[PDB]
Design brief:
The structure is a homodimer. Chain A is α+β, with helices and mostly antiparallel strands. Chain A contains 8 helices and 13 strands. The complex binds the ligand *[C@H](O)[C@H](C[C@@H]1CCNC1=O)NC(=O)[C@H](CC(C)C)NC(=O)OC[C@@H]1C[C@H]1CCC. Chain B: The active site is at residues 38, 142.
Amino acid sequence: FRKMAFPSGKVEGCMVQVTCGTTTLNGLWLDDVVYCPRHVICTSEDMLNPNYEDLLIRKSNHNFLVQAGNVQLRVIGHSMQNCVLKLKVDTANPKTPKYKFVRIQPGQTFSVLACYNGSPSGVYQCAMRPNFTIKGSFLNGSCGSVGFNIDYDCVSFCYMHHMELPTGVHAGTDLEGNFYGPFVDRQTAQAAGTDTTITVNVLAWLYAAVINGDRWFLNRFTTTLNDFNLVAMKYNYEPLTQDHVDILGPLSAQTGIAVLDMCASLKELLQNGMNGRTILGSALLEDEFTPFDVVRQCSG
Amino acid sequence: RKMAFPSGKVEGCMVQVTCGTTTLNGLWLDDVVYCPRHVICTSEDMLNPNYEDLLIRKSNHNFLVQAGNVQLRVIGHSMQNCVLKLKVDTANPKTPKYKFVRIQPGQTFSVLACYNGSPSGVYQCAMRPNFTIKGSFLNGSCGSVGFNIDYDCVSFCYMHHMELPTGVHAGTDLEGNFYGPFVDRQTAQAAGTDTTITVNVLAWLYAAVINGDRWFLNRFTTTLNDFNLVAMKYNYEPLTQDHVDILGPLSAQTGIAVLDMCASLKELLQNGMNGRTILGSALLEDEFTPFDVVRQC
Ligand SMILES: *[C@H](O)[C@H](C[C@@H]1CCNC1=O)NC(=O)[C@H](CC(C)C)NC(=O)OC[C@@H]1C[C@H]1CCC
């Protein structure tokens, strides 16, 4: 199993650059709107303590330089929605895919198209941590890069990049400008909650092991969801939700192993350790493959 | 972070190729579609296919090429080693600037995994020293390609043909020559003993340091040859002076001499990681090149 990104072409066709003064970042061009982080309107000095409504009132359409490559897109309207700027432009993007804006939950994975100056540099798979950070690879100028999933014809945009934390992890918003987690777009020191292990994804990984014939850890017992959740928290594992139990349905059906039986197997691993054994060629439990990711790499 | 090149320029080239009941992917550049020649085989052909004999018995019309909902008419075909070249009456307007290259073991590339001419996923691979790749490929993935992008130019280096019993993968360059001692017949094939790409392990250790992780460093040093003696004992590839030179920028950036990092790696090889982890991994990672690390740091 490897981290596998979605093909990035449909998103590459939507990346532009947005500049205000000398501050440049990336934007997302869909139909006749460009979406980008609102801190593009900030001087480096104003990022320390920005008053965004005040900064925006002083801006006009003609203060925004939007470019696809080196080709300018004329801005004909502007508005702020939470922490994102929406710039109406006079050209509808002919490469606009079928798309939607979604807000993902911790544990869910998505592909990031890392961009600089509106130019895509690389694509990689990220997991949203339970503390609402991602372990990105982002350099200066990467803001406005987006995270996405692709289902059939439709690009689901879920993440737009805004900042790095002192610990090196990354934070950002959905495409409605609402931050994931307790973060704000100010150049102030901000700390994330202590992180935890994504239980639903560990379970997905155990199911993947079973599918591949690696099943020594299956035991004869079961548990209730509440008993499991209370034990899991003592090992810094996330509690399971009802939605987690449901998204494990397909893998449970594929293997014939009930979700709560797998929970009891995981509980034994937590309480007793691996005892020098491995699972899928590893003594570490992997928590950044979702149930869908497992099905992706096992089917096509 | 393992990072692939953006795949859009390659996505615009992927098509579906069918012959008989065999369907796989092709690469459509200008007015030519490239694909694995074993598309012309049947069940009974695959064991010992005489490809020149099988191919002469085919007509242009035995090949169905589909780009989305549009069929492309094949107006000519030829074989170059293990690749079939199908001439079509339409030029791909999405053809990028491109070249065909043969990569060296230890080099990395991105794979666009495709099924039925449709892109499914992208990931980074290394050409192993034993000329396999550790890919994620299923039935119908043949004809998927590997590539690197420099400026606006796509350098195609890999086309996918097979899986080995061990679960690793084998394929060709875009001239149709295999990497490694493999053959496009339906037989169980073993690879040579694999080794670890040492220059890449060192690059990744430097990446761990750049991201503030240094538990594995030490105050010892080593000569190049003494390091290589230990490396070979542990089935690591030897480190050349060009490798040392290639690592210079990472050495400068971090203030750690290449041979000092070799001494750290030696200590890791002889003692293991004693439970610790580097950049999240319980194992030494060898599929990041020095360039991969630099570009991202
Ligand atoms: C082409 O799509 C397909 C891709 C492989 C299928 C499963 N995973 C793959 O990467 N290629 C093939 O099926 C090969 C065709 C021959 C003619 C080259 N064969 C193959 O990969 O077989 C796999 C198993 C180990 C070998 C045992 C043969 C008796």
